[PDB]
Amino acid sequence: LWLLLKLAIVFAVLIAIYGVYLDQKIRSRIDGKVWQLPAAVYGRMVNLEPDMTISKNEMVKLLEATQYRQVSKMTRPGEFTVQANSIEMIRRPFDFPDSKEGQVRARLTFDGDHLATIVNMENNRQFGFFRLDPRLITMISSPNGEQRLFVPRSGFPDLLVDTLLATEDRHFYEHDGISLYSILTQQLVKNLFLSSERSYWRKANEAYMALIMDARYSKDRILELYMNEVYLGQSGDNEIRGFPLASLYYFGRPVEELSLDQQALLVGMVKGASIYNPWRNPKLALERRNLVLRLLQQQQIIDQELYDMLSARPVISPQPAFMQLVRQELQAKLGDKVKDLSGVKIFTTFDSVAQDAAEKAAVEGIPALKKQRKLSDLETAIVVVDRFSGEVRAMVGGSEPQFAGYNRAMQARRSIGSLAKPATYLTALSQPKIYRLNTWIADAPIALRQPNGQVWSPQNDDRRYSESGRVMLVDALTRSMNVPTVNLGMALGLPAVTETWIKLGVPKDQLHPVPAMLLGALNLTPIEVAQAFQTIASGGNRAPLSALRSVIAEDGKVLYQSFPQAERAVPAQAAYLTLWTMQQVVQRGTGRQLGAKYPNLHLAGKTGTTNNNVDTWFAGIDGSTVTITWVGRDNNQPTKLYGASGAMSIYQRYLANQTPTPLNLVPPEDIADMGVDYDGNFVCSGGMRILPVWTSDPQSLCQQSEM
Structure with missing residues (x-):
């Protein structure tokens, strides 16, 4: 008969209200403090300068101690390249407390024992002192027990963004097509408010909560939050969360400088970083690093990269x-x-x-x-x-x-x-x-x-x-x-x-x-x-x-x-x-x-x-x-x-x-x-x-x- 309307509305409204309710903390959490970092x-921080008594070799030892990598020919920050009487380097970008700095290309030239010259390969100009970024030693125990290094959105290389999408493609603002399960998208909602465990209390609440998010928020930022939440291993009783830190942890590189071969691996572990924990059972971990790499477009090689993936000890x-x-x-x-x-x-x-x-x-x-x-x-x-x-x-x-x-x-x-x-x-x-x-x-x-x-x-x-x-x-x-x-x-x-x-x-x-x-x-x-x-x-x-x-x-x-x-x-x-x-x-x-x-x-x-x-x-x-x-x-x-x-x-x-x-x-x-x-x-x-x-x-x- 009827009722499907006087209930439809008595079914409406309560969606909202509660909707509006869980439309308020979803706001009144993301706005201010989003975590406990x-x-x-x-x-x-070393400061290089002409007539400093540092040898070329000394300098090399220095750069590697500071996360830089000896390459044949440069291509991105964190890299250097050794000549006879000089080093050319892409001084990676770091937020110095005297003046935030960006990447700089410089050739340190040495005369015998002492560094003689430091020049900007942009303007072919000399520096008087040239700053060197600090190494991240560690992260004081999070009382929350959850360790993160937060990098803004810009801090993420396009490919990384891409290769992440290429596993749970960003839709429109809903979900839909992706749900072709025959027996999801942004799931930030999941491990940010929701607990455990399995559905249907979950998925239901998850999706509704999701399209609330996606809606009254930016189709971008969603991934600034996301790429800082995902789980990627332990270091005792502390969790390891976000990509920014994972890079350091596994590869000792700023998240901004991941070769796509590694860069794709971190993307892979997202499904279960404990059973993927690259030290504990590498064999398995390597395979997941492949199902990702091995993925249609982009474009020429699943061969080169598929050779080895370091991941220090x-x-x-x-x-x-x-x-x-x-x-x-x-x-x-x-x-x-x-x-x-x-x-x-x-x-x-x-x-x-x-x-x-x-x-x-x-x-x-x-x-x-x-x-x-x-x-x-x-x-x-x-x-x-x-x-x-x-x-x-x-x-x-x-x-x-x-x-x-x-x-x-x-x-x-x-x-x-x-x-x-x-x-x-x-x-x-x-x-x-x-x-x-x-x-x-x-x-x-x-x-x-x-x-x-x-x-x-x-x-x-x-x-x-x-x-x-x-x-x-x-x-x-x-x-x-x-x-x-x-x-x-x-x-x-x-x-x-x-x-x-x-x-x-x-x-x-x-x-x-x-x-x-x-x-x-x-x-x-x-x-x-x-x-x-x-x-x-x-x-x-x-x-x-x-x-x-x-x-x-x-x-x-x-x-x-x-x-x-x-x-x-x-x-x-x-x-x-x-x-x-x-x-x-x-x-x-x-x-x-x-x-x-x-x-x-x-x-x-x-x-x-x-x-x-x-x-x-x-x-x-x-x-x-x-x-x-x-x-x-x-x-x-x-x-x-x-x-x-x-x-x-x-x-x-x-x-x-x-x-x-x-x-x-x-x-x-x-x-x-x-x-x-x-x-x-x-x-x-x-x-x-x-x-x-x-x-x-x-x-x-x-x-x-x-x-």
């Missing part, structure tokens, strides 16, 4: 240690208002090339080390900071870094052994009308009154004593002698030596000013050691070690900016002399093994050893950084190592795993290279040893030329 974690939690520092320095410098922020861009101090040289030095170094000496176990921690700024370049905290749970770079305090010796010599040499490099120190049997029964009788490594009964300031440190060290530190005063430590920048509640301290009764963590030697390397300026450079909000508002905050802790002339002496340590003295392999870096270094070598060390200073190397057993059992030669051969490795800048040591004012005689008295002309004296006048020389 984690913080991107970025490394250092996984990242669960890269850089667990450095990240620990960052994580820490954030909390300190901001408070809590941050883990509740969306799309933040943390720019750190991390150096890709350094981390690699080091991680490679460890994982390779220690096993090779255990081999020669056997040793059922062994461990290391490495720390590289910037000589002058104190910015932390690289941080290894274990024999296996990409595997870290415990972080020996930060949370393993250990006896610094002979590594303590310089604090004394520095404390003396900061006179300098009292103690000079040529100053005689007694080398004779020490026995000290221990304020609790015992009597301290320190001794030399070989236990001997100079037949002279004395030895010069220089040598004593150069060879890292005990007796003449205690002798000196004790004449300086423990309190005195103690504040130098305070000034170099070590934890205050670690100094206990008993004599042992002098020979290394002092338990620091490598990070802290790093800090001390930093302070001396820098010319005597305490720059507090720092992992952060900035931290920008989704918009562009700086939320924190790390400004230079170095401080004058000890006289330059003193620091100089300690270093120049340490240069001796590395060529003439204990670290002589290193002066040999790299005689041209003229490193300054100190050797670190403990009783029975339960803690070995080496502190190294090239022209541009400080590199603290620790080797020792987790259980403090003695290493059986040949002294500081354990830590020294890790460093040596790291030293060769990359290209160090040489330490060319410009002296402060009031530094005079004078000659001493054999009895070590200063002489006017001649001399047989020349030493850097700190004086505002060599009438010193003429005083020495009588008395």
Whole structure:
């Protein structure tokens, strides 16, 4: 009869109303916050410029460390191309915080060791500084547990857009034809509001909700949202969503630079990225990469591309240690208002090339080390900071870094052994009308009154004593002698030596000013050691070690900016002399093994050893950084190592795993290279040893030329 109308309407209206209802949250979600985006974690941005001392090879190592790819002939961003005396590159487009930049084509030209020229191949013009984009290290854990990197619509290559369509073609604004199922289109609606599981509660709600979307929204944007939602793997308990990140994750390339062969694979996995997870079961994953490629038009080749698809080897939690520092320095410098922020861009101090040289030095170094000496176990921690700024370049905290749970770079305090010796010599040499490099120190049997029964009788490594009964300031440190060290530190005063430590920048509640301290009764963590030697390397300026450079909000508002905050802790002339002496340590003295392999870096270094070598060390200073190397057993059992030669051969490795800048040591004012005689008295002309004296006048020389 009728009713099909008075119900038709009583069937209408309720479609709407509820329609209008679920036409309101569909709006009042997409408009404002659409997700909870984690913080991107970025490394250092390098700034190239003429006369920079970076080699061509050095540069190559750099570009690849930063995601660029050596090609035969360029074609898109992220690519470079090597010549005899130059590199041509398409500097990929990145959103720099001083000025968003776009892709740039540049030929870096080198003259011998130093980059000579950087030119824009557009205007055949020169740059004065040329910026290099940062590498994405990781993404701070999403509290939502859902990790994304959001790239706007433009950030998606046409083909990618296309090849995505070529599997669920975009219709009109409905659905229709596609539903030729004989037993869908944009399904963004599905995993954005809808839950689980199967229909018909779902599909019904999905479609209605879909044509609501499509309608009161742009047939474009729909795919800006879509291409940022789809699921493409896990990295622990975090999801991996959107294409932008997938590229990095699987292929380590901006989503903007996918070769269509890969580019199509990501499109394929959309059907079930867990059963497609390219590492877990590749065979299957490869096939899906083909049903896509193998698809009618476009146009010539299903052959070329079908050959191999790299997809590097996984990242669960890269850089667990450095990240620990960052994580820490954030909390300190901001408070809590941050883990509740969306799309933040943390720019750190991390150096890709350094981390690699080091991680490679460890994982390779220690096993090779255990081999020669056997040793059922062994461990290391490495720390590289910037000589002058104190910015932390690289941080290894274990024999296996990409595997870290415990972080020996930060949370393993250990006896610094002979590594303590310089604090004394520095404390003396900061006179300098009292103690000079040529100053005689007694080398004779020490026995000290221990304020609790015992009597301290320190001794030399070989236990001997100079037949002279004395030895010069220089040598004593150069060879890292005990007796003449205690002798000196004790004449300086423990309190005195103690504040130098305070000034170099070590934890205050670690100094206990008993004599042992002098020979290394002092338990620091490598990070802290790093800090001390930093302070001396820098010319005597305490720059507090720092992992952060900035931290920008989704918009562009700086939320924190790390400004230079170095401080004058000890006289330059003193620091100089300690270093120049340490240069001796590395060529003439204990670290002589290193002066040999790299005689041209003229490193300054100190050797670190403990009783029975339960803690070995080496502190190294090239022209541009400080590199603290620790080797020792987790259980403090003695290493059986040949002294500081354990830590020294890790460093040596790291030293060769990359290209160090040489330490060319410009002296402060009031530094005079004078000659001493054999009895070590200063002489006017001649001399047989020349030493850097700190004086505002060599009438010193003429005083020495009588008395």
